[PDB]
Symmetry: C2
Subunit: 126 residues, 2 copies
């Protein structure tokens, strides 16, 4: 059982104000810590919602997330929701677009995607 528990997921983002507007203001993560790493040269923003932790490294040095084809490594992060329509409505009201609703090919449960300011796919799944 060494690998049963996630400490955090880390994300690379391009712009500080975009990151606060999206993750903190809209998604409702709270700031745990914020520190500027002069050497690196970035901002490290740790965010908490519930027992979940999200670590965001912010820098204009990162090129675009590969697509068509996507690259090896982490692809997307999915959130479990109780009733997907209300979450979609909430996001749309905040100016966050969502893909049309569909069902999972192998499970039959509702799902869709929205995207962070740098185009990171974020899934909603019932």
């Amino acid at each position: 059982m060494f690998f049963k528990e996630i400490h955090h997921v880390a994300i690379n983002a391009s712009n500080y104000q975009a990151t606060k507007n999206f993750y903190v203001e809209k998604l409702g993560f709270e700031v745990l810590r914020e520190n500027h790493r002069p050497e690196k040269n970035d901002i490290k923003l740790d965010l908490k919602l519930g027992s979940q932790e999200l670590e965001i490294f912010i820098s204009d040095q990162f090129p675009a997330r590969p697509s068509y084809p996507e690259a090896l490594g982490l692809r997307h992060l999915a959130f479990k929701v109780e009733h997907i329509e209300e979450v979609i409505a909430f996001l749309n009201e905040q100016g966050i677009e969502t893909e049309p609703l569909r069902v999972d090919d192998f499970t039959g449960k509702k799902m869709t995607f929205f995207f962070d300011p740098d185009g990171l796919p974020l899934e909603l799944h019932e």
Copy 2:
């Protein structure tokens, strides 16, 4: 509280046997589902450990994970451990190399990284 709970994290991997050897056999994830998507053309492997779910898309179409610099998007996945030395020993015994142990710059807790077969950074953090 819409975004408080992770349904899963998705990973792109290059090789099927490498993926089973690493995630299932060594890390101890169990197979939840496995399906071949002819259209796509990949294998979708869903894995479960505890309440955690990991979705792995396996295909030789994905190019290398960007580094130097890393790209925008998901960067790494971190596991919470109780006593890091034993987890490191376990990994090393399974032929999985770990970076030298250090402490987190802002928290003082022990951490290190190991890497999946395609070079995805995976963190251990106390």
